[PDB]
Design a protein around this ligand. Structure first.
Ligand SMILES: Nc1ncnc2c1ncn2[C@@H]1O[C@H](COS(=O)(=O)NC(=O)[C@@H](N)CO)[C@@H](O)[C@H]1O
Length: 441
């Protein structure tokens, strides 16, 4: 089968052959978008084009965009290691129409690449589609233009409990370009638990969302109102790792060539032998987001972007501890990562030594309190009555040992114990008040 690198290139070659300008992935860190934490979609760098504020010399484009979804509007951090399909760092394969073509041709391009004998040649019978309930045009296109049997065309409304809150209405953020969308799912088969989209078991890893095609129509305002974009446009995105799994005849993202190699490297540096332990997958995921974020300029800190990076590094180190890592290990995975990323790792390779030192320093710094804090947590859990760790203890781990609350929650979750988040926040607020009282005016 095709390697991840070959699939990435084949996607771009397809759209290039269809007249799309190949554009380089943007950084994970925007210089000119105050509303955006980290790049979470291929469309981010074209935001102003969709808004009609910027015009390029091309009206259609294609990219393989590095994305991190670990905060802000789209955050999958807590899914990592619990599903076969979610990462913090991933590549989104995208095509874009800036007032060029619209619904029918967007859908045809996608179907052609996926199912043509000349291209990916996926079995059509295993593909399902969803449309926004009110999108009668998208429904008709799939039904009559493409020819998907009606039983595999699913209408989804505002299933997230609010107007425009839907798996089939995509929003860049609380503000920004958005619109109704249609998604393509691949059925991995009955050896995996799960039901089709719209079903009670839709959240399973059996029917995987491969490609989202967004019909950009509005700019969302902070108050929740929708202002029409000047020109209806197209924003699509397919997870490289998810389509690689399909094409490589495996079920999990972590079974593709890229992750198999990377997970072997994690086992090597941690001393783990069981290649099925979920901590190996978590660390493999985390090195991707951490290394690339540092390459794109993020430095560990206790505020904003730096704190998200710090949180992910420390969670990765903690997982290494659970695996029994005896020495500093996380920075050792930068080399192996560069080796599996191909051309998509160019920016990381360029700054290898720098990224390695940042990761090494951060792990060494955390090791000053990691084992001691875990010892305290074990002590508190051993005598804990109930299913919830008190907020005072969570705050003590934070304040004394530098444990972000989500790191503590992650450890506790592995033992079916919850964390009293309201209690943690109450403790933080109490300390804030003490700081105000002491500092004065
Ligand atoms: N956390 C994640 N891990 C791995 N793959 C993901 C993750 N989030 C999204 N994807 C993949 O990226 C595709 C596009 O993401 S999307 O949120 O659904 N859609 C968008 O971002 C829109 N901008 C359309 O491009 C998804 O269909 C899925 O295949």
């Amino acid at each position: 089968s095709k390697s991840t690198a070959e699939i990435r290139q084949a996607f771009l070659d397809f759209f290039h052959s269809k007249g799309h300008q190949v554009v380089a992935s943007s950084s994970l860190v925007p210089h000119n978008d105050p509303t955006l934490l980290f790049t979470n979609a291929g469309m981010n760098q074209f935001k102003d084009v969709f808004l009609g504020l910027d015009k390029r010399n091309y009206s259609r484009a294609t990219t393989s965009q590095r994305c991190v979804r670990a905060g802000g509007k789209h955050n999958d951090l807590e899914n990592v290691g619990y599903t076969a399909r979610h990462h913090t760092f991933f590549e989104m394969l995208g095509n874009f129409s800036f007032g060029d073509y619209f619904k029918l041709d967007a859908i045809l391009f996608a179907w052609l690449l996926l199912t043509s004998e000349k291209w990916f040649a996926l079995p059509k019978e295993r593909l399902w589609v969803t449309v926004y309930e009110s999108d009668d045009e998208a429904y008709e296109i799939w039904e009559k233009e493409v020819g998907i049997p009606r039983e595999r065309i699913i209408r989804i409304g505002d299933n997230k409990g609010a107007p425009y809150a839907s798996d089939n209405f995509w929003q860049m953020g609380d503000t920004g370009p958005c619109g109704p969308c249609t998604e393509i799912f691949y059925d991995h088969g009955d050896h995996i638990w799960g039901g089709p989209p719209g079903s009670p078991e839709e959240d399973g890893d059996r029917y995987i969302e491969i490609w989202n095609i967004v019909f950009m129509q509005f700019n969302r305002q902070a108050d929740g109102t929708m202002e029409p974009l000047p020109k209806p446009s197209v924003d699509t995105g397919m997870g490289l790792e998810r389509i690689a799994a399909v094409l490589q005849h495996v079920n999990s993202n972590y079974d593709i060539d890229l992750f198999r190699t990377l997970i072997q490297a994690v086992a090597k540096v941690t001393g783990a032998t069981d290649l099925s332990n979920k901590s190996l997958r978590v660390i493999a995921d985390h090195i991707r987001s951490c290394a690339f974020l540092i390459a794109d300029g993020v430095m560990p800190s206790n505020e904003n972007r730096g704190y998200v990076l710090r949180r992910i590094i420390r969670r990765a180190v903690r997982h290494g501890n659970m695996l029994g890592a005896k020495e500093t290990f996380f920075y050792k995975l930068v080399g192996p990562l560069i080796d599996v990323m191909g051309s998509a790792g160019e920016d990381l390779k360029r700054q290898q030594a720098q990224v390695e030192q940042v990761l090494k320093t951060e792990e060494e710094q955390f090791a000053r309190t990691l084992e001691r804090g875990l010892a305290l947590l074990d002590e508190e859990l051993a005598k804990l009555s109930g299913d919830t760790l008190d907020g005072e203890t969570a705050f003590r781990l934070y304040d004394t040992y530098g444990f972000p609350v989500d790191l503590t929650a992650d450890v506790c979750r592995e033992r079916n114990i919850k964390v009293d988040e309201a209690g943690f926040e109450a403790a933080m607020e109490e300390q804030r008040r003490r700081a105000r009282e002491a500092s004065g005016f």
